[PDB]
């Protein structure tokens, strides 16, 4: 794991804590490997927990958001010209350990072109699963220190998911307290209602297309939405305008 | 301050030789594309994904395991009505009802905590809540870690 | 209406429009006087249109609210001290009249202490009517120009009452054009409807409080409502916590 | 920038001899009190109020008159809600269905043109839209000034 060590970033400032990152195959056969990136927590702390997280997409990558715009230690210059420190970042307190996954995904990646074709909830889990017991291996003095998995929207998936295999694998080594979902994805049903209500309180859209959602949508599902939710959703889509869906009242960016 | 730029900065910063190389990133130079915040391809073609999740949670809530669900108010895509509608689903019984929890002299969202799991919003934070609202982010880490509700 | 004109208000900074102030009797009986404030469009502006701005509460102030700290010309410099110009004044393009309603508020008076126990919508709907055909005598010059009327809240209820008014009187001097309300009142069931449901959809109310506003509320009047609607309002109340109800997301000031 | 502390400038500022006096108002000295922004009295006092202004609406809008409302979003008193189905009520037909109006680079609201009323909503204001949203508000008043709709 010695390896894996960052001395230092470009740009980097100067701080009190070790970083780590590399690779992990998961499926020798494919080549298939996951990127991560540890930042622990100084000293002092230690031991901390440890506390793996996820960013969603599905198809994002947990070191660009969640690590360089986020929660992690540093923030990007403007021009990707260094780095900044981020006085919140969550490794004051934790061992944090960002993913990216799947393989396609940042950094990580796979040898058998055929993969980013075919992803899907179940590999990923299973991927993701083995990832962390090699990883223990590496890094062993992690071995039964609290640990916790969290990350945001469709790792509303992941999470959940993971944390299932995790707990039904009884590995030892890992001692999994818990996890922590933000804005994420839970039930298709409900959240496409709750989604449609919360647009027609923001005034976002009118009065008809709200209906029309409901029309459209109820039987889908989130991730793969039929032909009629799609048109429902164009139209909703054009009423909203050039807003940033994900910060209602901040600015978009030029 | 705020600035909803960042993806690009992010997008530059990672694609220099100097900064993979100091990762240990793309060691070969055998990652034949550019390094992008997000995988296009991987998010177009999505296979399974179950429609609910709530089975899982009523299983991990069985096992003792600590849940925390949380939502930036401000954010549309996944907004905080769909979460609440969902967790409600799961049917379990209130420990204690929706209230205000602070941070310094702000409310800095609300919270209500079932018995099995604890759910918490974000006064005014979007998507990224880590982004758009850092300190009350950090404090519901701290108290999510420690297993403790939010504060009043 | 040449003695109602201002010269310079203390801490005021220099300008390039008139303003006026005083005071008009509605009911010589009563001894109702009511208090107005008049900002006019610079020349070059000129011949601009009337505007009448309304505060709610009911039992705010125009003055106050509208003229001090919203669209009039300046805003009051902290602890009272002086003025800054509004960059944003509405009355860069309207001559605009604040008018302290009803009597009893702002600095409009009655002689008759009573009075200010026994408002409602009707009284003061034909006081604001009585003051206008005055205010005009006194401006002749704004006779026949277009004219508007607006107001948020409460004035939900005064603007088109007194815009009905106005309209059933055909008084010729006053060319209505139309009106403008913003935030209001509007229609008590369905206002109540809706707030609830906004309520609920921006995080501040319980599940269980919402169904109760939703059932002690809905008979009720916005004014006078029930027992049982105070009570649920109660809770909400402190679900709520500290934050400004009339702007969720910023701050309460200290 | 933004102060929410202003009704205390206010308060402040008309209770000086010297600026009543500027005013000309309470002339005598006869105005039995301190100067309050709200009267209180009042508030607590009211009598007669109908429960529905729809029918002055629907008067009014039969008059020819022009006829605007407009919305805070972030305003938690008279919410956008209330207003949404107020307005829906009257029953009126759409001549241009909800669009999100521009002011600048940014999006400033939303709005709706029906036969007889323009609906109009300001992102992000709060209850005192002119406090909240000043350039908003502005261009909102030129237009229903000229009784054109908000453009896009
Ligand atoms: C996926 O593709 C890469 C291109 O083949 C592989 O890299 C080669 O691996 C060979 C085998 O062990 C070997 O002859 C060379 O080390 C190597 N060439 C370069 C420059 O990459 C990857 O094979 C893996 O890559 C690592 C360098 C190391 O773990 C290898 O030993 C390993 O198998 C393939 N990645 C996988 C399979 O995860
Ligand atoms: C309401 O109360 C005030 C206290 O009585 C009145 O002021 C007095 O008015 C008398 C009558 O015309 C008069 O002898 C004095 O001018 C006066 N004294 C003072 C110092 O106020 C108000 O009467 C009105 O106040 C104005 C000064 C003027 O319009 C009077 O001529 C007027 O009647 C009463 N205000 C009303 C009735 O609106
Ligand atoms: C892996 O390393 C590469 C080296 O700097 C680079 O892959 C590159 O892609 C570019 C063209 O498609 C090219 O400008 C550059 O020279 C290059 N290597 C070549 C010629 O094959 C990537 O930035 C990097 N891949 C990632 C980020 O996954
Ligand atoms: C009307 O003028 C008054 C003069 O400055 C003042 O009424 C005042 O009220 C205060 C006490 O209740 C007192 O401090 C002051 O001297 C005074 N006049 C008296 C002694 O009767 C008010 O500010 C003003 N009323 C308003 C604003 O309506
Ligand atoms: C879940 O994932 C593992 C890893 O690839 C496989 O055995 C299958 O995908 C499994 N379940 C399925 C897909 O039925
Ligand atoms: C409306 O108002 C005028 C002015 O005081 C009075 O004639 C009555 O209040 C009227 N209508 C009523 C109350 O029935
Ligand atoms: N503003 C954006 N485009 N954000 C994309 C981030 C969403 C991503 N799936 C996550 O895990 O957060
Ligand atoms: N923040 C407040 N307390 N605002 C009170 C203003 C409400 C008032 N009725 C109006 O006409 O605007």
Same mark, same amino acid.
């Given at each position: 794991?010695?390896?894996?060590?960052?001395? #230092?970033?470009?740009?980097?400032?100067?701080?009190?804590?070790?970083?780590?990152?590399?690779?992990?195959?998961?499926?020798?056969?494919?080549?298939?490997?996951?990127?991560?990136?540890?930042?622990?927590?100084?000293?002092?702390?230690?031991?901390?927990? $440890?506390?793996?997280?996820?960013?969603?997409?599905?198809?994002?990558?947990?070191?660009?958001?969640?690590?360089?715009?986020?929660?992690?230690?540093?923030?990007? +210059?403007?021009?990707?010209?260094?780095?900044?420190?981020?006085?919140?970042? %969550?490794?004051?307190?934790?061992?944090?350990?960002? $993913?990216?996954?799947?393989?396609?995904?940042?950094?990580?990646?796979?040898?058998?072109?055929?993969?980013?074709?075919?992803?899907?909830?179940? #590999?990923?889990?299973?991927?993701?699963?083995?990832?962390?017991? +090699? %990883?223990?291996?590496?890094?062993?003095?992690?071995?039964? #220190?609290?640990?916790?998995?969290?990350?945001?929207?469709?790792?509303?998936?992941?999470?959940?998911?993971?944390?299932?295999?995790?707990?039904?694998?009884?590995?030892?080594?890992?001692? $999994?307290?818990?996890?922590?979902?933000?804005?994420?994805?839970?039930?298709?049903?409900?959240?496409?209602?709750?989604?449609?209500?919360?647009?027609?309180?923001?005034?976002?859209?009118?009065?008809?297309?709200?209906?029309?959602?409901?029309?459209?949508?109820?039987?889908?599902?989130?991730?793969?939405?039929?032909?009629?939710?799609?048109?429902?959703?164009?139209?909703?889509?054009?009423?909203?305008?050039?807003?940033?869906?994900?910060?209602?009242?901040?600015?978009?960016?030029? | 301050?705020?600035?909803?730029?960042?993806?690009?900065?992010?997008?530059?910063?990672?694609?220099?030789?100097?900064?993979?190389?100091?990762?240990?990133?793309?060691?070969?130079?055998?990652?034949?594309?550019?390094?992008?915040?997000?995988?296009?391809?991987?998010?177009?073609?999505?296979?399974?994904?179950?429609?609910?999740?709530?089975?899982?949670?009523?299983?991990?809530?069985?096992?003792?395991?600590?849940?925390?669900?949380?939502?930036?108010?401000?954010?549309?895509?996944?907004?905080?009505?769909?979460?609440?509608?969902?967790?409600?689903?799961?049917?379990?019984?209130?420990?204690?009802?929706?209230?205000?929890?602070?941070?310094?002299?702000?409310?800095?969202?609300?919270?209500?905590?079932?018995?099995?799991?604890?759910?918490?919003?974000?006064?005014?934070?979007?998507?990224?809540?880590?982004?758009?609202?850092?300190?009350?982010?950090?404090?519901?880490?701290?108290?999510?870690?420690?297993?403790?509700?939010?504060?009043?």
């Amino acid at each position: 794991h010695a390896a894996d060590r960052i001395a #230092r970033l470009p740009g980097q400032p100067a701080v009190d804590f070790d970083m780590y990152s590399g690779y992990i195959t998961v499926d020798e056969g494919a080549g298939r490997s996951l990127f991560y990136l540890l930042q622990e927590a100084p000293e002092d702390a230690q031991p901390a927990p $440890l506390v793996l997280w996820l960013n969603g997409g599905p198809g994002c990558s947990s070191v660009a958001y969640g690590a360089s715009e986020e929660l992690g230690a540093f923030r990007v +210059k403007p021009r990707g010209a260094g780095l900044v420190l981020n006085e919140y970042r %969550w490794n004051k307190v934790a061992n944090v350990l960002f $993913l990216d996954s799947p393989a396609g995904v940042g950094f990580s990646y796979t040898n058998t072109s055929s993969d980013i074709y075919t992803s899907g909830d179940n #590999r990923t889990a299973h991927d993701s699963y083995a990832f962390l017991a +090699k %990883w223990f291996e590496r890094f062993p003095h992690y071995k039964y #220190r609290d640990f916790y998995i969290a990350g945001e929207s469709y790792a509303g998936h992941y999470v959940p998911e993971l944390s299932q295999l995790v707990h039904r694998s009884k590995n030892p080594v890992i001692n $999994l307290k818990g996890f922590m979902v933000g804005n994420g994805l839970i039930d298709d049903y409900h959240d496409y209602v709750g989604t449609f209500e919360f647009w027609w309180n923001h005034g976002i859209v009118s009065d008809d297309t709200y209906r029309r959602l409901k029309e459209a949508c109820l039987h889908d599902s989130f991730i793969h939405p039929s032909p009629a939710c799609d048109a429902a959703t164009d139209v909703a889509t054009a009423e909203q305008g050039n807003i940033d869906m994900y910060s209602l009242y901040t600015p978009v960016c030029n | 301050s705020y600035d909803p730029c960042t993806e690009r900065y992010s997008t530059a910063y990672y694609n220099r030789r100097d900064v993979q190389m100091a990762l240990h990133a793309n060691v070969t130079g055998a990652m034949n594309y550019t390094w992008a915040t997000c995988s296009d391809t991987i998010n177009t073609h999505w296979h399974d994904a179950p429609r609910s999740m709530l089975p899982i949670y009523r299983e991990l809530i069985a096992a003792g395991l600590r849940i925390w669900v949380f939502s930036g108010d401000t954010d549309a895509v996944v907004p905080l009505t769909a979460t609440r509608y969902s967790i409600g689903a799961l049917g379990l019984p209130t420990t204690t009802s929706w209230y205000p929890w602070y941070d310094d002299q702000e409310v800095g969202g609300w919270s209500q905590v079932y018995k099995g799991l604890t759910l918490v919003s974000v006064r005014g934070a979007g998507h990224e809540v880590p982004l758009h609202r850092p300190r009350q982010a950090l404090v519901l880490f701290q108290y999510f870690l420690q297993g403790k509700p939010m504060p009043g």
